[model samples]
Target: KYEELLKTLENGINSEEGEIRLVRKSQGRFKEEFNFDLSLGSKPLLTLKVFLGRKPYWQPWVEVFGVNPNLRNVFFGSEAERKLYEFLSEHFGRIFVEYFEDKETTYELQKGVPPALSRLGFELLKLGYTYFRDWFIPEGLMEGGHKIQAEKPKTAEAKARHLANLKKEFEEFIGKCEDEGLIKKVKERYNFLEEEAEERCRLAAHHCIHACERYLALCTESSREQRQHAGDCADLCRLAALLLERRSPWAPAACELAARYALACAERCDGDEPLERECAGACRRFVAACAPLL
Candidate 1:
């Protein structure tokens, strides 16, 4: 159904009178092979830039089968992105292509899981997958995701309520993990089944180091006001990073600390004041995302 929609859209996009040629579905979804002026490509390049900035590189993978070559430049913006791109291009590419070609995933979906259960499960899973994909692609979280679902009101209370809601949701998620056997499973997996408290300590320490580095940089060029907000953002970012790195029982502990700090900072802001709430929110989301795994 989506493919058909794309075909229709592509036809319409291409049929318009212009020298800006676009060829869709060359080797990937919505791909274009064009020979036009580089100036003409600026709009497309800007489009790609915005997409790369906002969405996951692998989203196109879900849309089609492999990374669009045109989009490959995006995954190399930093050292980590460069290494990750190499890994994906070499290690994961062939296997992913073969799996798609042989219909291995399709067969697994059809045979192993019931269709109704599989469809609903896949759809639900896709939502989670999409969130994580976007989270991972930008190398870190940004502010765009949160405000998309609502109009951006220039009020402090509105922002505070939103931030508070996020905090509450995270707490509920962690509570669910406690109720479930997820924590135990995490401990067993990380070989920290007997040393759980230490896990958070480790994450907290490491994340503090990273956050401090980021905050120092951010604070250097910005005003005292900016630093005040950036400081909180840095703290939460560090906590979130450490929590996601959960290789031990201490991870959840670090995440909890982050959650507390974020909630505290959110409370400190005025109702209409806009601080770096997104930075804190990013940290919260990262920690929450890893809650189940932890």
Candidate 2:
């Protein structure tokens, strides 16, 4: 039966460049354990980064330990994997709801004014995802263009307008997440991580973006390998930045993407390329580290 399930994993694993090795053993007639080790011959930095920040930091580890939700509910034919996967997914679903609530509260406290709200919105859009939109609106500001006037509000009416605009943007963000199907089961979980988690993820996205942008500045270089690896890193960084912008519910999806990109970059480089290894290492660390959070 495990062998039968392996076929599904094979399809999924081959779709990406990296692979996993699974080993099963029995300690006694009635006891057995399955071990899965995900190995990446190439870098998937972007997805891994997203996974690390969203799930690992906010949730418990048991969710990712054995057969995953995708395998149990959608891929493998084995009922055992399916059952465990359902349990894990359901548990994570509850965790996600709580996290959402925490994140929402944090947003309200941090951006309760037009100026602050605008600043935060600019950061989110500049990054290109709606992760922080919910937090920004409740604080009384707008998420449009990044312009701030020196003149302070002269009347209560002007301040009220700013607050209204902020609410509108927040509503838009919620709508977007719904359309994307990222918040169907875990809306409350996001609230739990709205404050500190959002900030931390936001910074991580910023760093990844900065790293990729700097790498892209070398686009004119003649080495094909360098270009390919650098380009891959840049792509993953862009995605990570976008996901963090919204604190999107699809954190696991982003993490998977990051891990793949990071591994791809690593494959293009010679073993001596420190930058390549660093990128791959970061992705791996993020994916595994964030496993519990999801």
Candidate 3:
């Protein structure tokens, strides 16, 4: 079915004259499968999503994320919807492609169980798989259907109710096990490890150190003040990176000071040598990364 859909799509689909380009398939169901992701020959990058709605939104429609010039018309509606359905009806194929990349995953089953199932507090299961892919990853990855509610859940109470419902559903699904004995012994464990901001801060800090250190090394006696600022940048970046890495409570303040020093380093570097220019750019990135903290 996905292949059939791909067949109808092509490049140079100028939305200006009503031929809209297909970007890639939605990952609503295929979060596990990464290879089946398809796209036309790298045309205007946009996510092509087709959806059918019930009730007031009875129309089966599609969208190409605001294509240039005829931005409003990109939304599938009326004649647009008709043409799309007719085009789709012209071909048919199997609805699903079941696939998953098996990687080095462990701690899957047992710790040589003595059947007690206590003292089972374990961490750091070394699941080895390369994150990098040589395949066509669609723009923005995919929107999570589980996260997006069918109706607008306006109240805080509703979010709690939704969370509980989802929690129950997940627990129900995972409750069953291949080993009946093991199923009876397991406990519900739900934990989310927060790291996005920390990851960004650490990464930015490292880059800042790299660029600043390079500038400091290459800088001559002619620019004395620039060298001093670069020195300060390297140390401050180190402090920021270390604090962020350790997840210290004082890390936010440290990062703020680091960002300020970085700005000075960036301006003083003068953007003359490409290395210095890159140093300035890296400083700006670090500053932006820590902006939310302070």
Q: Pick the candidate with the highest lDDT.
A: 3
Please report how far candidate 2 places residue 53 from its true position, in Å.
34
Clashing pairs in 1: 155-272, 156-271, 156-272, 156-273, 157-271, 157-272, 199-250, 200-250
Per-residue lDDT tens digits for candidate 3, residues 149-240, read 12222353563354444445435645555656444444422222113445687899899999889888966653768778888898999998
Tens-digit lDDT track for model 1 on 146-250? Answer: 110112222544534543443354445445543244334322422331234344434543444344345435433445554564466456546545554554445
TM-score of each: 0.24, 0.29, 0.36
- TM-score winner between 2 and 3, please give it: 3
Winning candidate number (TM-score): 3
What value does the lDDT take at residue 91 in candidate 2?
A: 26
Residue 95, candidate 1: alpha-carbon lDDT: 12
The candidate 1 region of ten consecutive residues with least summed lDDT is 45-54
lDDT of 2 at 97: 11
Model 1 residue 8 distance off true place after TM-score fit, in angstroms: 5.4
Clashes of each: 8, 57, 0
Model 2, CA-based lDDT: 0.37
Q: Name the candidate, 1 or 2, with the larger lDDT value.
A: 2
